Amino acid sequence: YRLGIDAGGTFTDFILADHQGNVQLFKAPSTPHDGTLAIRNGLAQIADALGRTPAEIIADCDLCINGTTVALNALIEKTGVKVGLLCTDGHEDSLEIRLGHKEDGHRYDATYPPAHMLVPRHLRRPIGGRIISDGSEFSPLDEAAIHAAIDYFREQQVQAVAISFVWSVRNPSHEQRAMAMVRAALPDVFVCSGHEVFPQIREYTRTSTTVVNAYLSPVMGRYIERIDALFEELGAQQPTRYFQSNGGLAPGVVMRERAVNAINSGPASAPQAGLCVAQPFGIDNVITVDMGGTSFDITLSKGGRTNFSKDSDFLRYRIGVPMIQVETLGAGGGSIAHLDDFGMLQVGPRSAGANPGPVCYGKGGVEPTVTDANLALGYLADGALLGGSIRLNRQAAIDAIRSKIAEPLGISVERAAVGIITLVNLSMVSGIRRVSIERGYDPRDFALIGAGGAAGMHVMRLAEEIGSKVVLIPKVASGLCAFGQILSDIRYDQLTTLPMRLDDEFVDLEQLNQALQQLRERGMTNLRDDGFGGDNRIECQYSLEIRYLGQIHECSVELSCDRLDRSSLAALRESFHQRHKALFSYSEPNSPVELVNLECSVIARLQRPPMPELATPLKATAAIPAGHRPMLFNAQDDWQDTPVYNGDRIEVGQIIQGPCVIEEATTNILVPPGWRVSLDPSATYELTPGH
Amino acid sequence: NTVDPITLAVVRGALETAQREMTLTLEKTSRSSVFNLAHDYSNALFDHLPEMILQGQDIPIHLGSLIPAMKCVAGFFGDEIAEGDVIYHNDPAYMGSHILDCCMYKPVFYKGELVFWTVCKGHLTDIGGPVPAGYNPDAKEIYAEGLRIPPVKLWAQGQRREDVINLLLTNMRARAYQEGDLNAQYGACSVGERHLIELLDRYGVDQVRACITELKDMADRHMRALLRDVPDGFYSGTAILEDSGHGLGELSITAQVEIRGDEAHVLIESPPQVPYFINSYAGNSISGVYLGLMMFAQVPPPYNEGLYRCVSVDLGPSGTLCNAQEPAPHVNCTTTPMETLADAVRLALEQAAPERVTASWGHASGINIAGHDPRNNNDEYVTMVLASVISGAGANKAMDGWPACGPLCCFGALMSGDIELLEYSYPVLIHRYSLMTDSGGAGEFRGGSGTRLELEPLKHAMTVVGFGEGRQLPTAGAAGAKNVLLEPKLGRLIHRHVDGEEDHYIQNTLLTAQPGERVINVNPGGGGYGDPLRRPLATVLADVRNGLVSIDGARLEYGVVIDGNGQLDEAATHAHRAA
Ligand SMILES: [Zn+2]
């Protein structure tokens, strides 16, 4: 009864399941320029499982969940909507200011050419009105400028209008009159507004979000027209659903269309998937590390609110809309063994990929790769990673590691082979830190969950440096990006702002409670028009974001009971204090005065999904130790004959022997010495230091 | 030679991790992001003996100011420090920033040996001058500027030296801000110590310090290898400053660079020191010259002392603008003298390297330090860093120059305050923070345009600038940049609710503003590159229509004349291009 679409840009992941809970996986790579290939070229193959009509059988799916980030591609292709900007006089070009400088450190250069504009000052129309920090209209809305700018927008063939005014988050009448003027000019023109996209503080971020939403939203509009037509013409009973970066399925069939909450969502289900993999094991806080030869994607679920994020900056454009905070750092399996002309072995900056390939692939591969060092260590033998022409060459990797890394560095072939990999694993550790320490505390409490491709070659090593006790490997390699979107329920993030001091002054209980319950009503209306689960229990968890006086950046606070007063007000500050403490130092509290923003996310827990599960006859696991391979793990330095197991015939998990490699027809798992692993009925390998 | 390369990279990368950790501790708590001077800090790791092993140099105002910082701090306390102590100072004795930048020093002990120092700086709100800015134009008996702090312990073997911390708390207009920010400095220095101790535990001093000596050597050889590829000889640069000392004109910084293959020696030759806070001292001038070097070689990499092992500097005799001793008892400007100093040194280094000639930036020209009694019944004070954020990234062979760059004395890592961030935090109306027309460069590639900050007080506000170089702008570009007709900065006050127009040469007295009156200051933009008659025709047309260059501009700067017409008049285009 469920289909999931994960367009990953290399192949296309097609996830199909029914009451069996069987994770049935198809592939159908689509041209970067149109995605209708995935639907119509995948459904023909799902007819091939039972022998049922592909036009008929989509009707049996209660959910078609499509996660796609073509809006990200639109930001990339320099392709979009010619956007008009309605802005406040005197601050008309703040978008181009970008707060001074923020650019040295993430992408870098000598001659950084950042910030290709989305509004070119041809569409930077100021409006003379102005208000201030409390909602007082210092100067009224300049309707003349608006009318003239509308005529001008007609002149320049504008296609979408973004509006962002000063201080409208507490007095939005100016933006509202402007948006009314545009929509009431009766143009066939989609209009965005600051208070209706991201009504919070820091105007630059609000304006950037509004302009990007103006740039992309109607593209998603046309996409939903085409795809709703495809699925409703193919026989779907229910409204189609689309996977967001909030973890839920809003778009297309709701009262709110906004691409900014669809930008680079894709595999942001990764933590939702991690918990759907780990919960039968009783792991509360987990980190998924999904990777391929392309990059590394790291994320937590809970603890510090790594669950969500701050004002993110996508590629050069500042998008504020709440999203799950993940870290994508560098090139993974098919990355180059970079060795600069400065004496530094900085392996890992640039991906060789499959096109020149690793030296293993012979398609033009010169530089050694993580795949090349992996083979040099004896982790791959005949070829067990991807579904195509693999063409496994081996010694070229050993000699290339020698002459390109080992020979010039004054290190042996074996050392360079292990070291390339050491540095990659440490990069993964750093990525883990960006979300684990910077948002919380010691990862020792969490389980890693590897999945996909090259992750199995570095998770264990990475876990060994991270300190994870438990490593989880779904036996169905594509299971993570599948589960986390298929088990996606309805999720509405509703936010607002409320500058109010909690200390140095008596909190206005009625006002704080009013804002909180009004956000609750907003969530209630969101579900009212999306579809409220029938006598289905839903939850609103509150978040208040506060700071000490004079600081800029806040910290999040959880709120459990649905209304708040003094006997729980003081504890509120406690929630803050330790929180600030945990991020910065061991004793902060003197005046935790300022509160800034308020948020409630309503969750409608609607999923009733099937899951696969096993059963067991006996204790044998007799015929798995499939031969031996000369393998070097950095801890031996003698290349012991380390065993190789066939992961596809392993009987229900029996305790595994020490150091080994588990190869499946699909992927490859390392087990460094000291670890003990079994295959739990839930189609997950549990790896734990039982030795 | 017994340095394992894998473990070498591991050590350097672990250090990079700890540096980010500390920098973030300050970045989100220190208030030196949009309220204290923005990103006016750099945290750094120094050795058992006082040598810097890694600086994540994010802002270059702390480029050469830290190298001979540990010299006198660590050398005046020979043996008599212990685990748990911290030394604290800001004074320019033989080191140091402008005294509003103060910093904390913690040495790391390991089973009885001293292994390395952790240094945590940050720009503070006030230091205790008669002027709330700390930037005080009245430099009589130079002690007028503020509180100077020599090496004093503020922690000792794990405890607060409350006796003295309260001496330093007073003589400063902020109290709780100062207190919390020192708390954040201690926090950052503590995590900097914790990670590095974990490093010593995993490796042992015998490995960590071996790899560190190797990294110093790597920096040394890297800089020397670069120097091998520029011609030997004697080169010089000379650039001036005139809007100084009540606007009195003064002679230049003469930066002679003498390059013999692997090494370069730098002489400075500045005019005599002044009764103005723009005097410079040792660490200040050293950062200035190092910035002269870095502006054309490379911005990105990680930094340590090794880089400057082949760069010897000589500022000239004491008592001059570039090298003062006690005879000019104070300095708040690592901005005024240093800009001209850096220009001169870069001009020398580019005279040797025509390959990498770039155009000058705007210096930032533009401070406005403001605040007073708010609607909140307290003291609210800030530097309007916004007033001085953006000029333009000069202009290169292949760049128009970004008008989103910081200090303009400097690489550009500075970050402006956002409007709403400021109107809640401050009792003002930020009336305009817009971008200028015909304020940038003129060349085949023009510079970026700067800011127009127009500010209006809501109840009461004071305005402090004092900063120099706003009319005679030696921002001239790459030998062919024209600058035919351009606007510089004016410190302008419209007062009495009538069209006041008290135009101040940027060295402003302490001004004040009444509700409705407006203070305006603008940021002069960067230079130009080459001849502007060669700037692409469609590009010049777009630039004029973009609303950054006027037609009146275009006709005379670029030889691309527009009319109350559609495109450009085929013949009017070329008629004006005789020269
Ligand atoms: Zn400073």
Author numbering:
A (entry chain A): 6 to 696
B (entry chain B): 2 to 580
Source paper text:
Caprolactamase is the first enzyme in the caprolactam degradation pathway of Pseudomonas jessenii. It is composed of two subunits (CapA and CapB) and sequence‐related to other ATP‐dependent enzymes involved in lactam hydrolysis, like 5‐oxoprolinases and hydantoinases. Activity assays with lysates of Escherichia coli cells producing these proteins indicated they are subunits of a caprolactamase (EC 3.5.2.‐x) that catalyzes the first step in the catabolic pathway: the ATP‐dependent hydrolysis of the lactam ring to form 6‐aminocaproic acid (6‐ACA). The crystal structure of caprolactamase shows an (α/β)2 tetramer, with the α subunits (CapA) responsible for ATP‐dependent substrate phosphorylation and the β subunits (CapB) for hydrolytic lactam ring opening.
A 4.0 Å resolution dataset was collected from a single crystal grown in phosphate‐containing Bis‐Tris propane buffer with 20% PEG3350. The structure was solved by molecular replacement and refined to an R/Rfree of 29/37%. The structure shows a (αβ)2 heterotetrameric assembly. The CapB subunits form a dimeric core with an interface area of ca. 1350 Å2 (Pisa server). Each CapB subunit interacts with a CapA subunit on the opposite side of the CapB‐CapB dimer interface, with a buried surface area of ca. 3000 Å2. The structure of CapA is most similar to the ligand‐free state of the homologous acetophenone carboxylase subunit AaApcα (5L9WB 33% sequence identity and RMSD of 2.1 Å). No ATP or ADP was observed in CapAB. The CapB subunit contains 11 long and 5 short α‐helices and 19 β‐strands involved in 5 β‐sheets. Its core structure is similar to that of the α subunit of acetone carboxylase (XaAcα, RMSD 2.3 Å with 580 matched residues) and to the β subunit of acetophenone carboxylase (AaApcβ RMSD of 1.8 Å on 580 residues). The crystal structure of CapAB shows a metal at the expected site in CapB, but the nature of the ion is unknown. However, Zn2+ has a negligible anomalous signal and was therefore tentatively modeled.
